[PDB]
Design an enzyme around this catalytic site. Sequence first.
Site, mmCIF file in Angstrom:
data_model
loop_
_atom_site.group_PDB
_atom_site.id
_atom_site.type_symbol
_atom_site.label_atom_id
_atom_site.label_comp_id
_atom_site.label_asym_id
_atom_site.label_seq_id
_atom_site.Cartn_x
_atom_site.Cartn_y
_atom_site.Cartn_z
ATOM 1 N N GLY A 21 0.707 -1.400 -0.043
ATOM 2 C CA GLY A 21 -0.063 0.051 -0.073
ATOM 3 C C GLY A 21 0.721 1.244 0.122
ATOM 4 O O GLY A 21 2.049 1.184 0.348
ATOM 5 N N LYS A 25 4.261 -1.891 3.324
ATOM 6 C CA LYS A 25 4.102 -3.448 2.859
ATOM 7 C C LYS A 25 3.343 -3.912 3.931
ATOM 8 O O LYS A 25 3.385 -3.479 5.065
ATOM 9 C CB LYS A 25 5.613 -3.783 2.945
ATOM 10 C CG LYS A 25 6.692 -3.234 1.896
ATOM 11 C CD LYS A 25 8.091 -3.704 1.995
ATOM 12 C CE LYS A 25 8.816 -3.055 3.377
ATOM 13 N NZ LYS A 25 8.811 -4.326 4.110
ATOM 14 N N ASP A 133 -9.344 5.561 -3.117
ATOM 15 C CA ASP A 133 -8.487 4.893 -4.039
ATOM 16 C C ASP A 133 -9.041 3.221 -3.716
ATOM 17 O O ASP A 133 -8.207 2.354 -3.834
ATOM 18 C CB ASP A 133 -6.930 4.464 -3.169
ATOM 19 C CG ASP A 133 -6.209 4.254 -4.107
ATOM 20 O OD1 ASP A 133 -6.036 4.711 -5.429
ATOM 21 O OD2 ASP A 133 -4.998 3.681 -3.683
HETATM 22 O O1 LIG Z 1 -3.272 -1.631 3.044
HETATM 23 C C1 LIG Z 1 -3.342 -2.202 2.228
HETATM 24 N N1 LIG Z 1 -2.641 -1.740 1.092
HETATM 25 C C2 LIG Z 1 -2.989 -2.323 -0.231
HETATM 26 C C3 LIG Z 1 -2.782 -4.114 -0.234
HETATM 27 C C4 LIG Z 1 -3.231 -4.707 0.940
HETATM 28 N N2 LIG Z 1 -3.334 -5.881 1.401
HETATM 29 C C5 LIG Z 1 -3.769 -5.657 2.717
HETATM 30 C C6 LIG Z 1 -3.995 -7.210 3.412
HETATM 31 C C7 LIG Z 1 -4.643 -7.332 4.502
HETATM 32 C C8 LIG Z 1 -4.951 -8.405 5.316
HETATM 33 N N3 LIG Z 1 -4.599 -9.718 4.627
HETATM 34 C C9 LIG Z 1 -4.174 -9.722 3.326
HETATM 35 C C10 LIG Z 1 -4.247 -10.866 2.676
HETATM 36 C C11 LIG Z 1 -4.241 -10.812 1.369
HETATM 37 N N4 LIG Z 1 -4.368 -11.987 0.435
HETATM 38 C C12 LIG Z 1 -3.801 -13.111 1.162
HETATM 39 C C13 LIG Z 1 -3.877 -14.148 0.348
HETATM 40 C C14 LIG Z 1 -3.522 -15.568 0.691
HETATM 41 C C15 LIG Z 1 -3.256 -15.655 2.079
HETATM 42 C C16 LIG Z 1 -3.375 -14.612 2.975
HETATM 43 C C17 LIG Z 1 -3.662 -13.110 2.547
HETATM 44 C C18 LIG Z 1 -3.732 -12.300 3.277
HETATM 45 C C19 LIG Z 1 -3.979 -8.251 2.718
HETATM 46 C C20 LIG Z 1 -3.662 -4.497 3.265
HETATM 47 C C21 LIG Z 1 -3.592 -3.686 2.166
#
Ligand SMILES: O=C1NCCc2[nH]c(-c3ccnc(-c4cnc5ccccc5c4)c3)cc21
Length: 273
Positions: A21, A25, A133
């Site tokens: 983000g 990270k 966003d």
């Molecule tokens: O604030 C952010 N900025 C942009 C991308 C993002 N992902 C997250 C996020 C938060 C909690 N969990 C995940 C997550 C995403 N995808 C997954 C795939 C497989 C296993 C676990 C995962 C956790 C992502 C927060 C933010």
Amino acid sequence: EPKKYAVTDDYQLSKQVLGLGVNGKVLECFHRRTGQKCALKLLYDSPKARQEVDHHWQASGGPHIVCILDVYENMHHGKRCLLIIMECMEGGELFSRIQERDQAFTEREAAEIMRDIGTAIQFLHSHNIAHRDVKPENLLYTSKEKDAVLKLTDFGFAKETEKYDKSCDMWSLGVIMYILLCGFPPFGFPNPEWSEVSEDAKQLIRLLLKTDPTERLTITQFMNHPWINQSMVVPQTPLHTARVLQEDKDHWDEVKEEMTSALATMRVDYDQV
Ligand SMILES: O=C1NCCc2[nH]c(-c3ccnc(-c4cnc5ccccc5c4)c3)cc21
């Protein structure tokens, strides 16, 4: 509010990156005594980082918003940082999950997805937060299971407001709906993909995608539209979406990058004409 002791006292950290983000990270981590997998967002302290924390914390608990579990204020590599601990969104990204269906993705399913997002935006707009966003990276599922919940995250461009800022969310809603309904972004409704989509669906998109921000539907108008309001009565008609997402998977990153660009554009103080 914020814990001043070491995150590592409570969480075992990992080097597995779950996301990226503007302000930082996202890393996997585990609560030490519970064992629960969580996600760690490292923000280097800044007034922008402090705003993100503030806005996400206010939004946390609202429908369809990724919850904060705790926030830490730590020293890391000689710099003051904020660590947001949030629920692990183990289902991954919205459109990756659609893509991973073969199975029928139907207009009624898109209407229910869109209602969930609208419900998040409704909550935020009523608490005078505009996200600014809303995009594929920020739309996440709680699990890989059938009954996973779709939540919105990343308050790094959020603003405690402005109709203008709110209308940038409303616009995202129309872009995401457009992609939900056909598998490609609006940047008309072409056959074959649009051939069988509701007039309601196409009307809603035209009201959200108005070039003029002030002519765009507000969240209240969006939620009262019958396509959203009566989402469960929407036609169970099979869309091209997953198929197209699969076919053009090679151009997906580009789609993501031009949406990011479009949204940054809407965020500039003064733009070209
Ligand atoms: O604030 C952010 N900025 C942009 C991308 C993002 N992902 C997250 C996020 C938060 C909690 N969990 C995940 C997550 C995403 N995808 C997954 C795939 C497989 C296993 C676990 C995962 C956790 C992502 C927060 C933010």
